[PDB]
């Protein structure tokens, strides 16, 4: 169990750690989060009390280094930093724990939610979508645009998700125009899975990462990417049976975890109605279809 | 974006463009089977691809053998249309290729867009106009070449005959759409108007009769009468 200490909390802020969140008051004696489960990526995220705009945060994996948070009064945000001196870090953490100035990562033993949301998400893949190679952790916020959004403007601050476009030469073999447009299996299986992602685990990892950025930061280009990756699978007549079963589990836990009051903006009516009721895979997502119908029957 | 009444003169400017109408590509007669079920029999069809500035018509005849052993023919017909339009564009010299293709039915947008991916600079547009090109098969010489075809064939026409020697392409298009609208609303009466006077003939190399300017005014007036009457009937007003 690892720890992310905070130097201080000079501004009033709602702090998120994965699917949990805590309010901290201005200059409250808060010095970090302890008992963070090892084995998963995590995200620590922020919304200032005075500007409910720009949610922002950091993806990290405590196995990769000792990380802490420190407010910067010049740039006006809580920043993640790595502490390279191992004995200084242990000493800071032990003092803050002794003074009981840390919140505990509040995981219920029965609860597999975070594992289910991050099953295929790896830090090394996050760091290729979010390029800042001098850090082991990755910053994301509400406003960052995707490579595909930019094509349609600062490249260093982009989300380099894999570009998917159903009306593209990449998606459509010359001479198979109708076949490939109406059945996307060659684009899914040959172009994307065999060619670009190499395996379905990397595909699901990017899909799960896109969902989490949409949910935690309201990042619109991430929501576009999540839906596109769902649609590419559902619009393929030929998908490996293990992928469809895993997809149904992935989406089930995403829909279960989504705030009930954000379904209006984070869920695309066309994609979901097409995927659950018209597509090739309309009968292959039983768990997702059941939770969608009982939780969001309006959308459909 | 979409072509409508507000940007109508754009049709007659100097950027090459083509209208594509697919309404006569897949044609069937519906009939009863010996067992009392219903079946269809396809007949020859055509793609209607028209330059509204020059009158040049690229009539691709769709022979019924295209449909043999295929499923979902109404859907295939859109993609076959798109395949043939794309093949036509590739066949044209660069300086003859269109800068825009306007489809008369919105369901043709995605099929044509996908087939034209190789031509990212050719715009594929819908229209808000209700153009009467489905009535192309009411032009006797066009219907005759479609029905007689024994194989896929492209036949080239000028749908304006020699009108552009005397009138502009805006006026020629207006005459064409009036003639076709009339033929579409009451084919029998429209055809009666166009031939009633046996002294006005159709040249071997033309589609329509050789009317003088004054006779075209009479003709055009008879077509507008036909259309309005029909309309009061259709709607009882």
Q: How many CB pairs under 8 A join A and B?
A: 22
Q: In this complex, do A178 and B111 lie within 8 Å of one another by their Cβ atoms?
A: yes
Answer whether A181's CB lies under 8 Å from B114's CB. yes
**Contact with chain A for residue B114, Cβ under 8 A:** yes
**Contact with chain A for residue B90, Cβ under 8 A:** no
List the determination method: X-ray
Q: In this complex, do A178 and B76 lie within 8 Å of one another by their Cβ atoms?
A: yes
The whole-angstrom separation of Cα A41 and Cα A18 is 9
Q: What is the chain B residue with the closest CA to A168?
A: B117
Q: In this complex, do B117 and A168 lie within 8 Å of one another by their Cβ atoms?
A: yes
Where helices occur in chain B by DSSP H, the ranges are 73-91, 109-115, 140-148, 169-185, 187-195, 213-235
**Contact with chain A for residue B82, Cβ under 8 A:** yes
Phi/psi of residue A246, nearest 5 degrees: -70, -40
- Residue A178 C-alpha, separation from nearest chain B C-alpha, in angstroms: 6
- Residue B117 C-alpha, separation from nearest chain A C-alpha, in angstroms: 7
Would you tell me how many other CB atoms lie within 10 Å of the CB of residue A28? 14
Which residues of B fall within a CB distance of 8 Å from A184? Answer: none
Q: What is the chain B residue with the closest CA to A174?
A: B115
Which residues of A fall within a CB distance of 8 Å from B83? Answer: 177
| CA nearest neighbour of A136 among A4, A12, A234 | A4
Query: What is the greatest pairwise CA distance in chain B?
Result: 59
Q: Among A167, A169, A178, select the one facing B113 at the smallest CB separation.
A: A167
List % helix, strand, coil for chain B (3-state, nearest 5). 45, 20, 35
| CA nearest neighbour of A65 among A119, A6, A16, A2 | A2
Angle between helices B169-185 and B213-235 (to 10 degrees): 40
Per-residue burial over A198-217, b = 16 or more CB atoms within 10 Å of its CB, e = otherwise: eebebbbbbbbbbbbbbbbb
Which residues of A sit within 8 Å Cβ distance of B? Answer: 167-169, 172, 177-178, 181
Structure tokens at A198: 């190499």
* Residue A119, burial from CB neighbour count under 10 angstroms (0-12, 13-18, 19+): middle
Assign a CATH topology to domain A1-143. Answer: Substrate Binding Domain Of DNAk; Chain A, domain 1 (2.60.34)
Q: In this complex, do B79 and A172 lie within 8 Å of one another by their Cβ atoms?
A: no
- Distant-in-sequence, close-in-space partners of A123: CB < 8 Å, separation ≥ 6: A41, A59, A60, A61, A64, A136, A138
Instruction: Calculate ∠ Cα B167-B146-B175, nearest 5°.
Output: 20
Answer whether B116's CB lies under 8 Å from B146's CB. no
Q: How far is C-alpha B162 from the chain's CA centre?
A: 18
Which residues of B fall within a CB distance of 8 Å from A172? Answer: 114, 117
Tokens 């659950």 found at: A276
Strand A2-5 relative to strand B27-32, pairing:
unpaired
Q: In this complex, do A177 and B110 lie within 8 Å of one another by their Cβ atoms?
A: no
Which residues of A fall within a CB distance of 8 Å from B87? Answer: none
Q: Among B83, B114, B118, select the one facing A167 at the smallest CB separation.
A: B114
How do the domains of chain A map onto residue ranges? 1-143, 144-300
The whole-angstrom separation of Cα A94 and Cα A65 is 17
SS3 per-residue string spanning A14-70: EEEECCEEEEECCCCCCCEEEEECCCCCEEEEEEECCCCCCCEEEEECHHHCCEEEE
- Residue B230 C-alpha, separation from nearest chain A C-alpha, in angstroms: 40
Of 1.25.40.550, 1.10.3720.10, 3.40.50.300, 3.40.50.1000, the CATH number of A144-300 is 1.25.40.550
3-class SS of residue B20: strand
Q: In this complex, do A181 and B76 lie within 8 Å of one another by their Cβ atoms?
A: no
* Residue B45, burial from CB neighbour count under 10 angstroms (0-12, 13-18, 19+): buried
Helices and strands counted in chain B (H then E): 6, 8
In a mutational test of the A interface, the residue from B117, B120, B124 whose CB has the highest number of chain A CBs within 10 Å is: B117
Answer whether B211's CB lies under 8 Å from B185's CB. no
The whole-angstrom separation of Cα A223 and Cα A233 is 16
Tell me the HSE value of A142 on the side-chain side, using a 13 A CA sphere: 11
- Residue B208 C-alpha, separation from nearest chain A C-alpha, in angstroms: 38
- Distant-in-sequence, close-in-space partners of A169: CB < 8 Å, separation ≥ 6: B117, B118
- Residue B235 C-alpha, separation from nearest chain A C-alpha, in angstroms: 37
The whole-angstrom separation of Cα A268 and Cα A70 is 37
Q: In this complex, do A167 and B115 lie within 8 Å of one another by their Cβ atoms?
A: no
Query: Which secondary structure element, helix H or strand E, spans residue B166, and what is its range?
Result: none
**Contact with chain A for residue B76, Cβ under 8 A:** yes
Q: How far is C-alpha B177 from the chain's CA centre?
A: 10
The whole-angstrom separation of Cα A246 and Cα A249 is 5
Q: In this complex, do B114 and A181 lie within 8 Å of one another by their Cβ atoms?
A: yes
Query: Which secondary structure element, helix H or strand E, spans residue B121, and what is its range?
Result: none
Per-residue burial over B217-230, b = 16 or more CB atoms within 10 Å of its CB, e = otherwise: eebbebbeebbeeb
Which residues of B fall within a CB distance of 8 Å from A167? Answer: 110, 113-114, 117
The whole-angstrom separation of Cα A147 and Cα A159 is 6
Q: In this complex, do B82 and A181 lie within 8 Å of one another by their Cβ atoms?
A: no
The whole-angstrom separation of Cα A42 and Cα B1 is 45
Structure tokens at A92: 């800071």
Domains of chain B as residue ranges with CATH: 9-163 (3.30.420.230), 164-237 (1.20.80.40)
Which residues of A fall within a CB distance of 8 Å from B79? Answer: 177-178
Structure tokens at A110: 């029965």
**Contact with chain A for residue B117, Cβ under 8 A:** yes
């Amino acid at each position: 169990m690892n720890t992310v200490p905070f130097t201080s909390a000079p501004i009033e802020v709602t702090i998120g750690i994965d699917q949990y969140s805590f309010n901290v008051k201005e200059n409250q004696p808060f010095h970090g989060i302890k008992d963070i489960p090892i084995g998963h990526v995590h995200v620590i995220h922020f919304q200032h009390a005075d500007n409910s705009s720009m949610r922002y945060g950091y993806w990290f994996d405590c196995r990769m280094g000792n990380f802490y948070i420190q407010y910067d009064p010049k740039d006006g945000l809580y920043k993640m930093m790595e502490e390279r001196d191992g004995a200084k870090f242990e000493n800071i953490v032990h003092n803050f724990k002794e003074r009981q100035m840390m919140v505990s990562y509040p995981k219920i033993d029965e609860d597999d939610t975070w594992y289910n949301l991050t099953e295929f998400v790896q830090m090394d893949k996050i760091r290729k979508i979010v390029r800042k190679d001098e850090n082991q952790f990755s910053y994301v916020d509400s406003s960052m645009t995707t490579v595909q959004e930019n094509e349609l403007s600062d490249p260093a601050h982009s989300l380099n998700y894999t570009v998917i476009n159903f009306k593209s030469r990449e998606a459509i073999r010359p001479g198979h125009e109708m076949e490939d447009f109406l059945d996307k299996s060659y684009y899914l299986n040959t172009v994307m899975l065999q060619g670009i992602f190499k395996n379905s685990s990397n595909y699901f990892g990017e899909l799960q990462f896109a969902f989490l950025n949409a949910m935690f930061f309201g990042n619109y280009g991430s929501s576009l990417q999540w839906h596109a990756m769902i649609e590419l699978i559902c619009s393929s007549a030929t998908v490996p049976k293990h992928m469809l079963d895993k997809l149904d589990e992935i989406l089930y836990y995403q829909i279960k975890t989504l705030p009930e009051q954000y379904s209006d903006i984070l869920l695309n009516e066309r994609v979901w109605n097409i995927c659950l009721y018209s597509s090739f895979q309309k009968n292959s997502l039983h768990n997702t279809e059941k939770i969608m119908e009982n939780k969001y029957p309006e959308l459909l | 974006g979409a072509m409508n009444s507000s940007n109508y003169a754009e049709l007659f400017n100097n950027d090459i463009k083509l209208f594509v109408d697919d309404t006569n590509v897949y044609r069937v007669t519906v009939h009863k089977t010996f067992e009392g079920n219903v079946a269809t029999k396809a007949i020859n069809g055509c793609i209607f691809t028209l330059n509204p500035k020059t009158g040049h018509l690229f009539l691709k005849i769709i022979h019924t053998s295209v449909w043999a052993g295929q499923k979902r023919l109404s859907q295939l017909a859109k993609w076959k249309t798109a395949e043939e339009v794309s093949a036509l564009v590739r066949s044209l010299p660069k300086e003859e290729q269109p800068k825009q293709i306007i489809v008369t039915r919105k369901a043709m947008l995605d099929p044509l867009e996908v087939h034209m991916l190789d031509f990212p600079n050719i715009a594929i547009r819908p229209t808000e106009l209700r153009l009467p090109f489905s009535a192309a098969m009411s032009i006797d010489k066009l219907s005759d070449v479609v029905m007689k075809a024994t194989e896929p064939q492209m036949v080239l026409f000028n749908i304006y005959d020699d009108w552009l020697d005397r009138i502009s392409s805006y006026t020629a298009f207006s005459r064409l759409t009036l003639l076709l609208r009339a033929l579409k609303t009451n084919e029998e009466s429209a055809k009666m108007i166009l031939l009633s006077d046996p002294t006005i003939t159709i040249k071997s190399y033309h589609l329509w009769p050789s009317f003088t300017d004054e006779q075209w005014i009479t003709i055009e007036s008879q077509m507008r009468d036909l259309i309005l009457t029909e309309y009061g009937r259709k709607y009882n007003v």
